[PDB]
Design an enzyme around this catalytic site. Sequence first.
Site, PDB file in Angstrom:
ATOM      1  N   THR A 102      -2.487  -1.225  -6.895  1.00 57.12           N
ATOM      2  CA  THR A 102      -1.762  -0.305  -7.797  1.00 57.12           C
ATOM      3  C   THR A 102      -1.390   1.000  -7.329  1.00 57.12           C
ATOM      4  OG1 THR A 102      -2.799  -1.070  -9.863  1.00 57.12           O
ATOM      5  CG2 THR A 102      -1.881   0.940  -9.951  1.00 57.12           C
TER       6      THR A 102
ATOM      7  N   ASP B  81       4.088   0.796 -10.104  1.00 53.54           N
ATOM      8  CA  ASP B  81       4.302  -0.555  -9.619  1.00 53.54           C
ATOM      9  C   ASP B  81       4.097  -1.450 -10.943  1.00 53.54           C
ATOM     10  OD1 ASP B  81       1.272  -0.267  -9.011  1.00 53.54           O
ATOM     11  OD2 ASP B  81       1.922  -2.326  -8.188  1.00 53.54           O
TER      12      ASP B  81
ATOM     13  N   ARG C 243       2.495  -4.902 -10.362  1.00 51.51           N
ATOM     14  CA  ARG C 243       1.644  -6.069  -9.878  1.00 51.51           C
ATOM     15  C   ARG C 243       0.043  -5.821 -10.521  1.00 51.51           C
ATOM     16  NH1 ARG C 243       1.009  -7.456  -3.630  1.00 51.51           N
ATOM     17  NH2 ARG C 243       2.863  -8.453  -3.998  1.00 51.51           N
TER      18      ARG C 243
ATOM     19  N   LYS D 118       2.294  -0.399 -16.370  1.00 50.15           N
ATOM     20  CA  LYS D 118       1.029   0.623 -16.397  1.00 50.15           C
ATOM     21  C   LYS D 118       1.286   1.991 -16.705  1.00 50.15           C
ATOM     22  CE  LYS D 118      -0.094  -2.256 -12.218  1.00 50.15           C
ATOM     23  NZ  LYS D 118      -0.243  -2.120 -10.679  1.00 50.15           N
TER      24      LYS D 118
ATOM     25  N   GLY E 260      -6.638   1.028 -12.005  1.00 53.89           N
ATOM     26  CA  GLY E 260      -8.067   0.520 -12.164  1.00 53.89           C
ATOM     27  C   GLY E 260      -8.452  -0.602 -12.890  1.00 53.89           C
TER      28      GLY E 260
ATOM     29  N   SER F 286      -4.793   1.884  -5.176  1.00 53.64           N
ATOM     30  CA  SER F 286      -5.126   1.680  -3.770  1.00 53.64           C
ATOM     31  C   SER F 286      -3.790   1.970  -3.103  1.00 53.64           C
ATOM     32  CB  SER F 286      -5.363  -0.041  -3.852  1.00 53.64           C
ATOM     33  OG  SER F 286      -4.066  -0.527  -4.638  1.00 53.64           O
TER      34      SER F 286
ATOM     35  N   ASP G  16       1.065  -1.730   0.564  1.00 50.74           N
ATOM     36  CA  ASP G  16      -0.469  -1.914  -0.352  1.00 50.74           C
ATOM     37  C   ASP G  16      -0.334  -3.515  -0.518  1.00 50.74           C
ATOM     38  OD1 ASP G  16      -3.028  -1.493  -1.379  1.00 50.74           O
ATOM     39  OD2 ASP G  16      -2.158  -1.174  -3.106  1.00 50.74           O
TER      40      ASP G  16
ATOM     41  N   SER H 114      -0.520  -3.566  -4.366  1.00 47.35           N
ATOM     42  CA  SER H 114       0.730  -3.084  -5.154  1.00 47.35           C
ATOM     43  C   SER H 114       1.873  -3.910  -4.919  1.00 47.35           C
ATOM     44  CB  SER H 114       1.096  -1.899  -4.972  1.00 47.35           C
ATOM     45  OG  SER H 114      -0.211  -1.043  -5.129  1.00 47.35           O
TER      46      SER H 114
END
Lengths: 233, 250, 244, 244, 204, 243, 222, 205
Positions: G1, G17, G19, G33, G47, G129, G166, G169
């Site tokens: 994320t 993002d 995902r 999110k 999280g 992340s 990442d 994400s």
Amino acid sequence: FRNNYDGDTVTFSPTGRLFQVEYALEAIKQGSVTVGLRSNTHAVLVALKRNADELSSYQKKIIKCDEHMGLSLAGLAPDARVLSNYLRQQCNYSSLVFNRKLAVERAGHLLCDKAQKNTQSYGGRPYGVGLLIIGYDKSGAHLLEFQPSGNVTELYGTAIGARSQGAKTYLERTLDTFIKIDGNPDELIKAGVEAISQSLRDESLTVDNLSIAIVGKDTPFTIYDGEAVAKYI
Amino acid sequence: MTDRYSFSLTTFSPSGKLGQIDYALTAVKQGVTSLGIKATNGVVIATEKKSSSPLAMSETLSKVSLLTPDIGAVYSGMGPDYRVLVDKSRKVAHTSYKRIYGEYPPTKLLVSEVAKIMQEATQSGGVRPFGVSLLIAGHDEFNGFSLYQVDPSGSYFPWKATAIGKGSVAAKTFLEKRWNDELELEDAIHIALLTLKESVEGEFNGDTIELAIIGDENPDLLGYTGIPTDKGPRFRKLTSQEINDRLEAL
Amino acid sequence: GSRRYDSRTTIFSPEGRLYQVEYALESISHAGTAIGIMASDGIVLAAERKVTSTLLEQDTSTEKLYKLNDKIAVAVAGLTADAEILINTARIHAQNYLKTYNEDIPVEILVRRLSDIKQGYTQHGGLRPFGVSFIYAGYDDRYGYQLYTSNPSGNYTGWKAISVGANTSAAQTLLQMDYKDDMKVDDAIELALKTLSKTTDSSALTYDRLEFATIRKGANDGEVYQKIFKPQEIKDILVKTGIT
Amino acid sequence: GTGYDLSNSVFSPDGRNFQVEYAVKAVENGTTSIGIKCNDGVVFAVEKLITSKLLVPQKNVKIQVVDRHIGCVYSGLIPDGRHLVNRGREEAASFKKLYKTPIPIPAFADRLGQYVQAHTLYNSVRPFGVSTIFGGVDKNGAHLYMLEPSGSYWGYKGAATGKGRQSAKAELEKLVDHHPEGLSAREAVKQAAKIIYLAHEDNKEKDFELEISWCSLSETNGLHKFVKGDLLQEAIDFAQKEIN
Amino acid sequence: SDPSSINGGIVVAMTGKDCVAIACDLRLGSQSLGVSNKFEKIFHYGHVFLGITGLATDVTTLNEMFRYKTNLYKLKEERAIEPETFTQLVSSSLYERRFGPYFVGPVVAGINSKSGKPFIAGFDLIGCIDEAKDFIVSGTASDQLFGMCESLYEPNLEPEDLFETISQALLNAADRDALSGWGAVVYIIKKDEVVKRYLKMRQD
Amino acid sequence: AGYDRHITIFSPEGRLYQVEYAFKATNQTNINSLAVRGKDCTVVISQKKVPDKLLDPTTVSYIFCISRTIGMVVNGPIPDARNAALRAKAEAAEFRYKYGYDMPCDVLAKRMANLSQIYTQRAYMRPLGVILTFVSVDEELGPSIYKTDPAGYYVGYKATATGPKQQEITTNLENHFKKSKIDHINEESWEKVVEFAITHMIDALGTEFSKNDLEVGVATKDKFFTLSAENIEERLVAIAEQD
Amino acid sequence: TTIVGVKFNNGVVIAADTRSTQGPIVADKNCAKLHRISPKIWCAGAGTAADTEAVTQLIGSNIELHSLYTSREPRVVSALQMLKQHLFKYQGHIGAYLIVAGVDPTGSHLFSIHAHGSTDVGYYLSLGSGSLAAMAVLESHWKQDLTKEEAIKLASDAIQAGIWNDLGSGSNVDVCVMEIGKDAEYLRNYLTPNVREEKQKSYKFPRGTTAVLKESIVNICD
Amino acid sequence: LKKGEVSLGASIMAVTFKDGVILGADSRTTTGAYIANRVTDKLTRVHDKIWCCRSGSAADTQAIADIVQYHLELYTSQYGTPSTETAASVFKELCYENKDNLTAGIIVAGYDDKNKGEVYTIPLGGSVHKLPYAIAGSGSTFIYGYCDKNFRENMSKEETVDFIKHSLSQAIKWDGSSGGVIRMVVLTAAGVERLIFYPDEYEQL
Ligand SMILES: [Mg+2]
Ligand SMILES: [Mg+2]
Ligand SMILES: [Mg+2]
Ligand SMILES: [Mg+2]
Ligand SMILES: [Mg+2]
Ligand SMILES: [Mg+2]
Ligand SMILES: [Mg+2]
């Protein structure tokens, strides 16, 4: 007038009286007489025990609270049991936690506060018993008078119960004399018996009648009942 | 110390009357008039702002309250009792519904929840009933528009139109004549204004009246754009000027 | 102290009667009459509405007949709000039983539990009783169609036909007159309506003043159908029977 | 109707709490006690009645200390006073525990006040039957206060309560008028003894015992100490001197 | 020790042209021991279907809890719960046990009776909602189903075709999972009608 | 049945006598107060009467500093007044901890009024016999005056007065505002508003005041404070020139 | 994320993002999110998804009730203090790492809250992340007094850094812009740079392919 | 310290001087080797002239400071302005009574007219120590020698700012958990002054 202001201890009268407490003080007045007096070395409690018929025992009036303190009761006995138990516990805690003997002044203070709680809250009822507390602590001999209103007073001698006023006068007269009976336990006791015998009327104090207790310098609180009070009539 | 009043303060008298409930209803009778009218495409609830002094700022006292974005309430009776009932109603709307189903409750159910709060004040220990009657108006997807009245006993009933408080008998009468099932919201606002004018003693204008409707969705009152499923609150309090504009077309 | 303000709702009168219960029953006698009639093939619940008007929404209303289950319903006589409190606890008990046993709750079990709650308010707690009387109409695999009734005391009993609320003596007399053990639902409907018509305290029995329900086991299915009559349906059935 | 004076928290038609007023009567039937604020401390004094010769002299101490800098004396029902002081002590301790500094006198007063007032809020408790004079020295001076059964309290220059309250307040007003500069603790001790002796005339039928204590930044270090020995006799003499 | 791997099982839901589909296998096992081949994981409250994979005692408990809650809902609201609404109810019910969760993976499939829009949703064991427009997979063969679905799925299929698709997604995903299989059931759901078909598959 | 005048239950007329009797207690002190709003301040004036020559004048106050921003003047017995002050101070502190911003005068009033409503409904609690006037210069609303009473009622005012002679003060203020046409004293300095206040209290009560006869609280952005005898005198000495 | 918050001259923008992962599997290729706490206070969360939605909705609910009670528009410092005291109470067990931004009567605000209960204030923040990839961008192109247009791009680019670099994400970019005088504008899928190419073949099966054993009708209505 | 939570690392100190007291701190917070925030404010106000430097857990110290701020606001409303000793006591009570779950090393510094400037250090256990100056944070180990050699009582503002500035730059130099800017808060009768010094200045001294 009254049934309006005497139904609970939580009600003050228009003149500022607490009737339930005053009625409690009356049960004491119908109890058997008990005297307390002390010199500078010992404190004695003398008590006239009462029976119900001539086929029964004479109800005990003296209770040992610890080796250095005890009391005589007058009024509702179940209540004296409740309060002497508290005193026993408070005496015990002092020894256990502080390795210290509870001072009589402190015992009195504790009794007062326990009695008060029962006079400011609803549903409760005042205690209906009076107590004479004698003891020997670090400051010497002591005699205290406790009344259910929570008033505890330190005295040289006193008496409570029916006709208590007689002995109360003898003591009030004999003060100069008994306050000096140092080192002579038996004399102090005799003064106590003389005192108590001034509040008699019904009969003469016999061996099933008298109860005496003494505490002092080298005397742990000890109760003399029947057999051992013979030498004092 | 302590609430030792664990017994009912409302009990049945020999005639089967619940004393405290009857007396609370009397308190409601001496209150300012409030009414509600249900139209085909809306509902209007209205009341008079009986300001108890001219030094008071009448706007700081809302008698018409939003409970959810699609439900509003007005009352007649003891103001403070209503104020706490509103707080409790706004909260229960969340605790017993939004936090469970992710949507605001339908009118009847929110009504049912306020009613329960009022009933318990009628039986629980140591309390007196609420001295208010409420008119709750709202809308929801499956039931459309509705208007309900809730009494101190906790009984609630649905109405086409009704009035509560001081001149409720006369007002309920004016409403019975004027009401029909083909009224557009503007017409109900009109009839509401007329009905209220008769109950109102003095100055009748946008600063002494409080009206709110439950109507079309108001996107300009949402506060954000972007999510299409939530189209805006249906509850809207008319401003001082919006009322005046309608009073002139009397 | 506080004793002063306590009405003592759970004491016995010198004659062994429960004051509050007796007074609650009095309140109940002023409520619109609710009638329940049990047939060989269904049950009928009919009730007269109290405090009405031309402006009340009868369509979106329910103040006397409530569904407790798909197979159990009650007719209420008394304080509507007190009734809703109890009705909801009954609805939950029915679901608790279903979860526990995976079988619909037998009617008497639901009835007994509700009554026990009422009884409680009668013996401890110091709260006023619930001013409600219920007529329960329900079906189950053990006893079929049943009709019970409970009052503020918490006593409950079973009937072939019963009424609660205003003018019970009169209604019961009429029921006991025209009722026959082999009745059919269509026939029970008529009787219930006839009875209300002759006991009403108001002018004429009109649709807007009624609530009507039947629990039938339509032979072309299997599941028991609870039907809460809609305004127009009450108007329709009121004509066929002959009250206009 | 009537009955507005049987339960504590009830407001009478004229806004009074009769039970609190009767408590005041218990206070007026009590011994006189006073407080005199001085240039850097406070002196408390009280009259102790000698019910008989059997009472041990100087042992039934009535003045009480809270923490190490507050003195408290009261008139009325003695046990109630002890109850208030026990609470005072718990409150002073709580304050010191959390904030490290001993409780300021104005803070302490309010602590007593809120507790006493609390006893005028419910019918399940009885109001305190005492008026308490208390005070001591803190971060910014000496403070004297007097608290009534209603929970009402204010700061004083001198204070008196009990049977002889009027003579006392009379004598107290004399001191505040003649010495606007302040009074030394030494003089205040003497004057307190005087005021009590004079006040004692309002109860001239029993012999008495004088009790004085003070808290002074220069004579006691801002700590509360009883007036004992030389100091006490000097004040007793000065008292039996200015009486005739 | 992994409560989500003790009993085995999978559920998949897909949306189509004016329809949805939810299917599941029928196995109930105890580690390697097959125990029942009649354990359906799809339940329905009115027109809302819920499939649940995971620990079987919780699957059974949750079905019972949702029946309870949807029954009361119907009584108070006087209408049957909708998919969007039920979805929120499932989520809130799962998160209520955030620190001692039910070891399940619910999946909701249904069609809104007012708007007619097909709806499916998935949840993790603590309630997080995944409202996809394509498909939802759950179970011990979730990776496999994701693989099958990502390739086999194409939007707006008719009931007759979705059936084949969901069936194949399910069938082949199960055959690569030791803990799934022993039978399968597919529900093709339309506004008016719902058809339930049992599939023939390997029994090993 | 007849005890309907002792606890908070309805009388057959739908009245709560204990609440009514609580309103009479607010007048037991014989102190009047008034509050007016300036252009960017709010002033409250309250009479100060120290009878007993044995009292320390510095401790007799019915004005309380609730928070750095809210001030409160009480018309009622001191013990109930202080019971309310303590609660208000606690409510204000808790609000700041929990919500991250200073509790608004109007919100504090609503809260205190809600607590009062409770004493009105629950039989074990007696109403407090006090009227609370809360003042501040709100960051969103500007100068504010919200007053709550024993019935649990509260509202905001252009200005207000409270006490036995409430009506005389109220009619006076009412007349000034009908004459000027605005909802506030049009002066820039809080000192002139304080003067306006004292002037109108004098004109209304027909009484003259010295420095020890008044008590004054002023609310300005980010602070509420009470004036000293000497600051009041400077106000008095400035007024003895228009009159 | 990857979630970011960037403060601009008269507002604040947050982005994230879309995902959602369960281990190495993409459970949801387009989750949201960006949560609404109140009309003008939004929060980005990273999280544990159930936790970020739960803590957000709970505080949002209580914030809605606080607003109705006080008759005032909600403040970011309120959502901030409420969110943080709740998260601190649970000692990190509620895995919510949030970027709360919004406009209220006192101005525009941007704060971050870590699961254990600590908050930070800044002009640009990122969490997740993908936090490092995004911060590398924010640290390279942020400058004071950014315009609305510049902030949307900056925040958008930061999210892209995470999407691309990442594995935690991916997919799209969601943005929500909160400007001082305007309504908050939620831009769901502001950027969609990861569309799947058309498949090489169609997997539609010929009807009858699946072997059916039993077929029957389900009864829905009562 | 809980696994993965934000750490303050830090180089913080509070120094009393003639006119009062000055608090100083770096501005770096870390989660491992990642700098979560490079411009944090570790100088927290619990009262007008009573501040604290925070070190340890970021969450814990914020929670604690938030509660002390509340207790002092309520104290103030009832009893007037609190002493630094009282503020330290409230801090101590929380740190000591919850020693099992908190990681907070707090330095409380404040200014009063009667007492001038005061510094109280509340280390990990919850004990309170009043000192002329105090240093804490992970970067403090490195300046124990420097600080003991250069501190003198009754320094001037200019001198104290310099002492704090040199000390922390050294602390920041050696400790990886310290960095960013050097913030200072000067507390005197005149008021409250906020100072900030950037890397380019302190790094080469
Ligand atoms: Mg007096
Ligand atoms: Mg899986
Ligand atoms: Mg398999
Ligand atoms: Mg096999
Ligand atoms: Mg009350
Ligand atoms: Mg009471
Ligand atoms: Mg470094």
